[PDB]
Design a protein around this nucleic acid. Sequence first.
RNA 1: UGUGCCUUA
Length: 400
Amino acid sequence: LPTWSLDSNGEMRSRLSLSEVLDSGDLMKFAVDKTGCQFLEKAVKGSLTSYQKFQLFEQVIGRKDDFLKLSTNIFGNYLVQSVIGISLATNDDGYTKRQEKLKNFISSQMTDMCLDKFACRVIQSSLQNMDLSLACKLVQALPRDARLIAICVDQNANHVIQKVVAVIPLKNWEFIVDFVATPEHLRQICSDKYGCRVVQTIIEKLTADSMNVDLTSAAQNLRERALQRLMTSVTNRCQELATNEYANYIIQHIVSNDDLAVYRECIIEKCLMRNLLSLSQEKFASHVVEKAFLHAPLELLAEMMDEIFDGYIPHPDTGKDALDIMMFHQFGNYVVQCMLTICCDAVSGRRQTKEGGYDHAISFQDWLKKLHSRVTKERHRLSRFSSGKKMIETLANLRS
RNA sequence: UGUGCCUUA
């Protein structure tokens, strides 16, 4: 940093004024230095004369190249965000030009910035602080090709998409919904550590839940359709997503949320029914099977219960059935525990048994009797395992 | 006995 600003022992002077720095032409040097940038940070949080503001506007966010340089800088990016805030607060004659220029700078370099660890932070705060019409233009600058995928699955850039989803009306980012819905994109993005969070965030935004009551009816309609398009695509690839190490959380999210009930039933019918035994044996899909049991509508839950109890032919030699296999399987045991607990909740009053214009209590009692009889019969083998001991305990707790 | 992400000096 500038020698004129240092003391005898090579350290930044203590009585340095913001104006000295602004007048010196050496701001860029301070802004990329930790000590210098922090001094600037504190200095710009206080009172500022009009000229001080004017200079900061020109030197921090007035020229494209210096703007990118600081936005991509580990320290500088904070000063950029602070100066943008001040610019937005300053309604002088230059307000409109400064804001348009900031739109242009970011837009023209949108992809480059999104992917940069530090510039993406500048993007995200700009999206929620800038006038909405200008923030909307930033969204428009997002790429529509393979770069969008990279953005969705980047550990830093994914948060730009999530911010867009949070603070920008849907119409501006509808293209992302459809982009992600493409069979090949859906596969990649959902099967990615970060991308699956992005898809979930999208689904949540598209959900007609309590958080969306402020939407106009026209906007709800826009949302309903976008949700329906994305769900169609998720449903077509339900099997692949359910068994995937990352996308299974998405299927779980849809199956678990009452506000997505219609989609819950689709998914269960499309990839779960008739596959319950095999999926209960999958590391990742076993968690989806549990969610389905927990949240299926009663009529469908009866089919699921019937599939486990009666749906499969016992082994030709040993007589082992689906229930034997699942009870002792490293992943299947959790599903059977889930079925048991559902039944105990139902007959214990902890779970509503009325639905579809009828009291299914009789059904839960039947299922429970089956499980109890199985566990009674196999108590010795079962008690060798934590899972078996848990079920035995669950049943004993029910008696009393 | 069984999975993730939620990111800056």
